[PDB]
Design a protein around this ligand. Sequence first.
Ligand SMILES: N#C[C@@H]1N[C@@H](CO)[C@H]1c1ccc(-c2ccccc2F)cc1
Ligand SMILES: N#C[C@@H]1N[C@@H](CO)[C@H]1c1ccc(-c2ccccc2F)cc1
Lengths: 405, 398, 249, 249
Amino acid sequence: IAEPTSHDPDSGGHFGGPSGWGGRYVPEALMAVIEEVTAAYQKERVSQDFLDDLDRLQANYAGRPSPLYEATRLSQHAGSARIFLKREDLNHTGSHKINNVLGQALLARRMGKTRVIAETGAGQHGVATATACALLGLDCVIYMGGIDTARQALNVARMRLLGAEVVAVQTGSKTLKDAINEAFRDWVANADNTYYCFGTAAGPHPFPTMVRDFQRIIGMEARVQIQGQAGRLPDAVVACVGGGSNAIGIFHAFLDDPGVRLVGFEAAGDGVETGRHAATFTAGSPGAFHGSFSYLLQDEDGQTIESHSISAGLDYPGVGPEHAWLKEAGRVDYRPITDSEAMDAFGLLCRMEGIIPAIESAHAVAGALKLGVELGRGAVIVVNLSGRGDKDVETAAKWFGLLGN
Amino acid sequence: SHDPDSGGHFGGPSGWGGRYVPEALMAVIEEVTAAYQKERVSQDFLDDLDRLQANYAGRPSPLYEATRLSQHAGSARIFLKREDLNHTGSHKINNVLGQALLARRMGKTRVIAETGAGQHGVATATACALLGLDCVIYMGGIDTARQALNVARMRLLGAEVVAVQTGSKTLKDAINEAFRDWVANADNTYYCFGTAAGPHPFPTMVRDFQRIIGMEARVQIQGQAGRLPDAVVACVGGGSNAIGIFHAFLDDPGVRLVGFEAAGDGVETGRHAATFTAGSPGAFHGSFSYLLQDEDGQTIESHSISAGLDYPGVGPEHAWLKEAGRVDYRPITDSEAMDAFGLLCRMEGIIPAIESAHAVAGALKLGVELGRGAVIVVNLSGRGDKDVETAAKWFGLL
Amino acid sequence: EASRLGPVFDSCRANNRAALIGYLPTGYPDVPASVAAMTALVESGCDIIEVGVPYSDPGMDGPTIARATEAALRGGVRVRDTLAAVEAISIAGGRAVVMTYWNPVLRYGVDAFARDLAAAGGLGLITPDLIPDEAQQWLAASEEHRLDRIFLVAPSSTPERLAATVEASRGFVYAASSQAAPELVGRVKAVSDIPVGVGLGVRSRAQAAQIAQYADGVIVGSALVTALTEGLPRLRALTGELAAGVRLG
Amino acid sequence: EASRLGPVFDSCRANNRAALIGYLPTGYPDVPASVAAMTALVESGCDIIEVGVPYSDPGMDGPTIARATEAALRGGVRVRDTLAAVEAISIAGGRAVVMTYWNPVLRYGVDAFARDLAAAGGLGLITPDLIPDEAQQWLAASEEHRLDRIFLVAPSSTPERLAATVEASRGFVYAASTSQAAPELVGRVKAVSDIPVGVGLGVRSRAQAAQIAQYADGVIVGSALVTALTEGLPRLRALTGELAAGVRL
Ligand SMILES: N#C[C@@H]1N[C@@H](CO)[C@H]1c1ccc(-c2ccccc2F)cc1
Ligand SMILES: N#C[C@@H]1N[C@@H](CO)[C@H]1c1ccc(-c2ccccc2F)cc1
């Protein structure tokens, strides 16, 4: 059943008032196709046949529900609090991103689109998108910077095995932005046949709401599971925060539970004081960026500052506008976690529970250990384990001296 | 009913299975057997295992109708039992959770295990980290030198890894060295063997820990299709994933069971791992079963593009099911396997393990044979993230 | 009340010509050189100058302008240098509007930027990533400080959104873009008498003359950046050719 | 009624000594060189010769014997070469048993191998990976062709399994143990049976052999004979001479 729209934005995509967070800060050139996707999503989100289609793929193809695992061997390192891991690491493709791409690729077929495009940094969203396109028989084009392309040979080859065309952009800085720039423009030129699959809970309206709606399932499952295992609602629910899809997806079901603390953990890199971080809420300020009014890392003139993190998925200078609203409203706290804190948590999770987390997810684990110390013995903390760490084994092995020279 | 006698023999006087081990190992083998007999009927143990299967490993795995493969399978209906979605990315997690719980119930503090390219080593190190057991993986020196990241996974999980430089420096020699360790260290050590072979109780015990694949699959297919399948198929190395999925269907007489094994460059070329198609009966690694061997009974080099199917032996329960006519075993080449790998990627967005692609290739041929509307369940034993580099080279994408 | 740029188009239309509208980004190849280039445009016959504020994440910039804005930012260019460039152009007898993405204006203060741009002699603002739907603060600032507001329309714009964008614009409306451009200009004429500027990767006298048949303004940017990169004489010669192109009789 | 090796252990105990039991693998460094070495053991004072059948996967062997057997297999050694070696030893007046893993015997045919071992003058089989539990066919063949059956016991052997392994053995029991573990294992055999017991304990010297002859009926030497033969045939002779004198102490 389509769920109530109490925490939704207005028809312009604004959270907290007619000129609040979110909106559409995009060129008039993109508006036709944005209005087309918005109408298509309005129709389909209340369609029982669309939700049946998505649920059938969620169940048989993607492996939902993911389990909730009490990591009893982490307890000692979290002040004897009880850490429950929501296991999105077990999803097909190894993260929560599959939930988003399945929804949007279904939507593309509903709209009559034959062709999907997307962009990617390290490659996770590119693989997820290419996976969904292969399944639904859509032509896929992934935009990736030449600097990312040549240093991610295996993810490029994954995408090509999946039938997608990977386009290495060899102009300008040859990184994530030149790829985006070319995708946006592909969309405009081929709008009658092409859908743009965006990878996080950000961008102009309808993307923050749509992406969050395709990730709500995490929190919905988790709310039921924790009451089953713990016997009550948790003291806290936490997650790592890039653009914010996995965090908002687990948070949403708990928004109206006033006893449940919600905590987002963001990448502090080498430290917030060093200027090599992605601590968007901790160090950033309000502004227009990548289609929305939200928080970003920006200088005195409003230019975007390069972010840095050991994790690729948290290495983003902005954050989704629903998170900005929830911060202003006092409902969710956002806290910094450094590279080191995250890597310690990565290693700890490997040794104690045998789970190799994504380094993104390790920021949430790291933060969950600190919150466990603060909240104390017997406290119940649900942690979104947004992905598995197979992609991160080489980075981690280097960190811990396991390769040598 | 399908269980062996007390000595571990299937099929009575054929004498498949048994215990072809030295007297030095028999104290600890009788100990493991007594422990297993005790814990298989203990409610606490089965509860512990079910709880781990559900909340930790992600069971049940789904059954998925791969409708975009149908046109490449004579319009048959291919259903994929998705063991590729399990924690660690394969069926091996089912086995190591069972054996590691047993290890701790026995009071053993140290677990050893063999591995080829790293899959069972990683799985074993995963279960030992979870349960607080000390873990030592034995891996052939040819494999450790070209699998550095899997060695690092194992180390990140808290396991030690030993490069085995004895014999031919590959899987069978890793098993031989783990065997020597267990002879010396049996007081405190449990050997977590990675397939449905070895001496009694290993073939029975590994199969029992894998039976859950077939029990779920039989329920799910009746649910989704409205009937038992026309065929259930699986790739066969040592035999754990196949026996796991086959077992619940054994007393359904209209269900064809087909094991697909690796033919490498072709059975006629001498570069294969087709144990049933080209091997012969013998005693190897503790069991009387089929084996790739020369005229004097010396083990010969196996060859496949798949590392998981590279094992020159096969489990004795499969040898018994072959003799009884219940299961058929058919060769699948590297080429056929890699064509199916690519096809599953392009059609369903699922990157299979190259082992599992042998099963998919076999299912495509069986589909053409059985015709439109036939229902074929395929065990998709693992995910193919580990095989992306091999597959990319095969297809010229690097 | 009439727009700030109304008298320029009146004067062009009376002489049977389109206004030549010339874009250069502040700080390319450095700040003083960009100011000298903008001055040279006024001297060589540009009717209106678009002063670009370089931005780290420009969506609507082609390769030529993107490389140039990247270079300007590498050389330390500031939003206040765009205000100084506006003063220099006003001092040289020119007429300047600023072309900018919205975050630098937000960071500055929307009312504060309108006031300081107005004080500097600036006549208006081109807002490539601000649509009417988010423009409430900007309309208030625009009315308060008597600045023109140039929104963009596109070939794909719906009838409803086109009419809303034309209704919200003052000065001119930027038709950014076969026959897609005259069709778009035609659709604006059907709902409004507002002057329409056309941008079309113009790089020659002949292209400027084609556009001057149907449009009130000819917008040129990439070709001016390409010419300046060669040098100041190339830019003078090209602007001279484009000024001849906009004149029909 | 009596075992085939019964008279040899009678002769030893009458002469106040243990039996020297020497192992070498067939085909190391090649087949003729290996037969010359086995004949030189008989000449140098070995009472019983264990002719090893090289096996591709010898789990119970250490790297000295394993590397030799690997070299023998690289040189193309065959199971039939082991039976030719058993014949050369018998004709030279020595007393030969075969040590082999069970698969080569299965591949030969159990009954066939026992028949052919007997016809070569071979007196028995040592079976490190065959336990009495799987020895149904072997017991029948052993009785049929009058060969001794030397099963192994270990320190870990349960009381029940040790008694059964001893009861199924004819000729001698091999107490494999590779300080006080070996003599305790020999004591546990003696408490249920008067069958002779051989002890392998990685013996490499005269003094080590003498220590074992004090409690065990047989001193088994393998690894050190292979190491000696690698140096040369005269080194093998000298080392065998030292061990033959050790067992008389
Ligand atoms: N001009 C302008 C804006 N500057 C660029 C980046 O800030 C450009 C832009 C382009 C596209 C998007 C977008 C993102 C997610 C979903 C859908 C979208 F259209 C956002 C911004
Ligand atoms: N001696 C003797 C045998 N020569 C070797 C080859 O077979 C050696 C052996 C090796 C491994 C095993 C084994 C395999 C799986 C589980 C438990 C086990 F013990 C048994 C015997």
